[PDB]
Amino acid sequence: PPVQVSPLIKLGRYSALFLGVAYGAKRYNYLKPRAEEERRIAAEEKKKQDELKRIER
Amino acid sequence: NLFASFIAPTMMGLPIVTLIIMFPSLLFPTPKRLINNRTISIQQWLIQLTSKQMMAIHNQKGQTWSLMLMSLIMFIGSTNILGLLPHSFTPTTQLSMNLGMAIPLWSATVFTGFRYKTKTSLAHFLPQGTPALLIPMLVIIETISLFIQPVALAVRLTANITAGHLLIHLIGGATLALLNINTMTAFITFTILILLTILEFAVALIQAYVFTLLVSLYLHDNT
Amino acid sequence: MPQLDTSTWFITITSMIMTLFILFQLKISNYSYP
Amino acid sequence: IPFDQMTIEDLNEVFPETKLDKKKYPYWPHRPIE
Amino acid sequence: DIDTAAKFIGAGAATVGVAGSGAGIGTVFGSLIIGYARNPSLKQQLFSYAILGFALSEAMGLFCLMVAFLILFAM
Amino acid sequence: DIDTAAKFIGAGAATVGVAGSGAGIGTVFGSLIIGYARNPSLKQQLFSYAILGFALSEAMGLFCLMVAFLILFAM
Amino acid sequence: DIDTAAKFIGAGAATVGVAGSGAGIGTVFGSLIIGYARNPSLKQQLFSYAILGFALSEAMGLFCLMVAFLILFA
Amino acid sequence: DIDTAAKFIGAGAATVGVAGSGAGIGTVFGSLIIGYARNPSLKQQLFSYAILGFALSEAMGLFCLMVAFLILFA
Amino acid sequence: DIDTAAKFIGAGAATVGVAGSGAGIGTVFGSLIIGYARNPSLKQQLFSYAILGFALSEAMGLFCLMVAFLILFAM
Amino acid sequence: DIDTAAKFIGAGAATVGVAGSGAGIGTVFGSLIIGYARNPSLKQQLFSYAILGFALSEAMGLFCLMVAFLILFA
Amino acid sequence: DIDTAAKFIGAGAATVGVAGSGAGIGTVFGSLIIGYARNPSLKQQLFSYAILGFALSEAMGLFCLMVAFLILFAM
Amino acid sequence: DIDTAAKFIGAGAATVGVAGSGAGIGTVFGSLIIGYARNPSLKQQLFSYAILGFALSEAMGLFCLMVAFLILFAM
Amino acid sequence: PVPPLPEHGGKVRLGLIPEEFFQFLYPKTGVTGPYVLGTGLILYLLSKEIYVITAETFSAISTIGVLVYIVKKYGASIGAFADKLNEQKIAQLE
Amino acid sequence: LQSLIKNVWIPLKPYYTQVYQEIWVGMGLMGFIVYKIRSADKRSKALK
Amino acid sequence: TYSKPRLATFWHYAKVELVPPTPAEIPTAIQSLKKIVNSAQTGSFKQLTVKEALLNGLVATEVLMWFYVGEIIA
Amino acid sequence: PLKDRRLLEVKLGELPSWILMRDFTPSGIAGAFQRGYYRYYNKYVNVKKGSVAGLSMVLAAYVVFNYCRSYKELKHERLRKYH
Amino acid sequence: GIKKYFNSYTLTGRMNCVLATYGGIALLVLYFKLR
């Protein structure tokens, strides 16, 4: 015997859905660039470390 | 990197590792009626069976230790099994654990053997009617292979139990790595893990039996 | 070899005694014959 | 009383021959393993 | 490095302590098939005493490989 | 590289755990020959035990070999 | 360090001691299978002798790992 | 090069296993001799069993040798 | 110094001369088992010979442990 | 030089893979002794078999050592 | 010096030859026990064959042990 | 020279093989004992077979020691 | 003089989580309330990395697989075994 | 502790006094061994 | 496989419980929310019993974590 | 009509009234742990047809208990850094 | 004689012989402590 959903929770449901979806999209978009730049700088650092051990083996 | 699990843990700066050793005692409730539920009937039957099957050889006086031997086997088997769970801790694999639980029984046997049956016990150091050529070369050997009882009797069980945990950890790690790379290897290694899990279930019991049986016949010799 | 960082040793051993000689020697001692 | 409704003392009472006498066998299982 | 190479070679040596395991397994199963063929009645106890020995040899094998790893990964 | 030296030296010297498989194969097949020669009846079941030993021997075989290849180059 | 590299060498070499113990344990339990199949009326005594042999041949196997560890950690 | 030495060191060290082939095959044909000497009417197929076992163990030993080789030609 | 390093390695590889005692004792006790089964009214002589065998086998296996001690501690 | 010493090691190692062949020959002849002691009539076939077994094991050992010979001049 | 290290390792390795003696003596007494189990009317002849096989196996081990001592204390 | 060390270590690693001859001697004399304990009237022929096998095993045992000598001293 | 046993303890869905919890949650969502609740909880934990994944996880998977295998393939037999022992003691003492 | 004494000294009295006299002496020997080893390791690591 | 039966069983409840919102009941929802605000501002929730509060919290969290689920989409 | 009830029965704001109606001595901790254990026992064990669920609970609980014990050391391997 | 006074088959002889060897080895080890 299914019980009909109370309207309150019904309304609370899909607003949360779509605001969260937007939040995730924004998080991805804003987070990608800084992380890429940090990783590239780390790549420069590890190249420097490799050169160091090449000359200071 | 992976010995972590053997590090005697505490949730905070307090001695909780005196509870990891209590938990088994719960899984065995005690009865008070005549008949009971299942989880007592089955265990009662199991203990009756093993008691019948192990104390056969012993003479009358020696049979006084039945309770001790069966308590020891129940406790060790319980711990060695419970250890298998996903993120569980096994007290036995602490070498101190095993030495604590091994030496006193050994020494108690030797003492009840020398206090009683002095001359016969001393004689045991000379196997009956050996050639009369090698006495010095023989009553050195028996007396060195006596004192190597307790050390073997502990270090064995310790090494057995530890090896399985380490092997399963490492095989699982390689499983995750293969899953990162490819699939066929991941699956085959998972099957290997299944097999090892079964085998460890097995050795966890075999060790309890072997330990209490060695102790049993040691008491047999010097009862 | 974490089994050799002897700091803990004492406490571990103590448990044995009471456990292996206080709890089980009650449970099992309570069992009865068929 | 149905079998399900007793404690070991009950058969100690009704059936003394089933008693586990504590004198001739102080220890556990309170007599030999015949 | 030299410690690392030494670790590797010590591990390689520790590996070969398994042979006792394989020998024991082979011999115990040969003994099972033999002591069976000439008494098929009591297969149950034959098989039980087979598995017990199987375990008490795999134990030695694991001793060996445990020491090997113990050296390799955690000194 | 010195580490490559011990790499390959351990790799080779860890492949010597295979004697435990050869000796067991030999013993098991010999036991089969003798037991079967006695009684020519239970041929199927005897060969079954034979395959079980075959597998539990190549068990140690591939065990040691997998460890060798585990630390041959990668780990 | 070489002074400890050689120590690793020695531990790895001394590891292999037990292999003899593995062989001995296996052969003894094969002998017990056979001598129980032959005259099943002596399981008891034959098992006693086999486990005695097991004790002896495991002590004479664990000596060597004890020594290997003694070398490693001192 | 140090590793150049290691190549041949390992390749040589990596054939001692064949000992297993010796122990096996010896035991194999010994069992066959006894068998045929207990029941001459099984020869023509105990021989098949012997050749199976021989092929097996010989293959194991020879592939161990092939290992040794592939180390030798890294 | 490498000298003491070689001391350590030599002792560690020389103590390997005890597996022989392992296999020898295993065979001796298996034979005692079998040969007691068939003739169960001579145990006293079977046991005397078995003791001779164990004792002298393990002695010749222990000489290698003694050599390890005597090469490490002194010379 | 490194190569000379490494070759020496390789030979002194690969030369050890023949002890198993010794045990194998011992076993095959022990089997023949037993078998003949059972069935004296067919000596001629017991020997016809043992000889072939010896040939195979000896060949295996000879290859195991030809390894070392080639190492010496590899 | 390196010469000391090499002598030291070499002697330690060479003294592994005693394994074969352990296995030999083991099997010799095993076979004597099993064979004597059948027919006790041979005590003396049996025991003589026992002693002979003993001497040969033990000597084939003594060669390796003695030559190890030779290389250590001579060269 | 380092070749001194290489010579010594190679000799140590080479002498090891003789264990096989120990195994063979033990096995053959065990089988002699069993045989003669079965059919005590073929004594002479049994002994002849045992001596055949003995010699055929120590043949290649000494062959191992001979290659060892060759490596150690000449090259 | 002792009270008897019930006939069956509280049922349990999936073998782990009791039903009564499903009842306390029925009125508001009725049927597919608790199940989506659990799915959300688990996707959260996996997603917020309050539960990292490693080798020991797959060890857990294999051990739980073996246990479900054994229980499903032998539970009824073991239960009948236990009841047999009970009635056997009854009779033999009867 | 009265509950304690009446719970773990009515049943287990006959064992400690009668049977397990020879395990307590062993535990004393262990007291020696453990004390010695802990002392040795503590001292050695204090040196370092 | 038995996916079809139980999956149809689950659609039976989903189509009547997973439905998206419709503008019809929005007035009911908003008036209920305002009634909750009224019960809160004057402290009328103090009238409730513990179980009711626990249940409300559980359902509120049910709504909640499905927010992180929505993120999981992203 | 009763001062003592079941905490689930309680009326919210009376929560401090309840917290002050009970006893918090360590004996009052033992008399709580025992009550919880006996609830579980008599409800899922002491029944003729006890089943896996009649035991699987305690194991599935001890697993999470050890997981909590193990959390701290497990924070050094989260696969994704910018969580 | 000794072979009936140092019996290796009964009990008394075994005890006497083992005790003698412990005594002798003890004396020797104390002898070598000086050096």
Author numbering:
A (entry chain e): 2 to 58
B (entry chain a): 4 to 226
C (entry chain 8): 1 to 34
D (entry chain d): 125 to 158
E (entry chain Q), F (entry chain R), I (entry chain O), K (entry chain N), L (entry chain M): 1 to 75
G (entry chain P), H (entry chain K), J (entry chain L): 1 to 74
M (entry chain b): 1 to 94
N (entry chain j): 2 to 49
Task: Give the article text.
Adenosine triphosphate (ATP), the fuel of life, is produced in inner membranes of the mitochondria of eukaryotic cells by an embedded molecular machine with a rotary action, called ATP synthase. This membrane-bound enzyme is a machine that transmits by a rotary action the potential energy of the transmembrane proton motive force, generated by respiration, into the catalytic sites in the extrinsic domain.
The bovine structure shows that the structures of the membrane domains of porcine ATP synthases in a tetrameric complex have been seriously misinterpreted. The central cavity of the c8-ring contains a poorly defined, noisy density observed also in the porcine and yeast c-rings (S13 A–E).
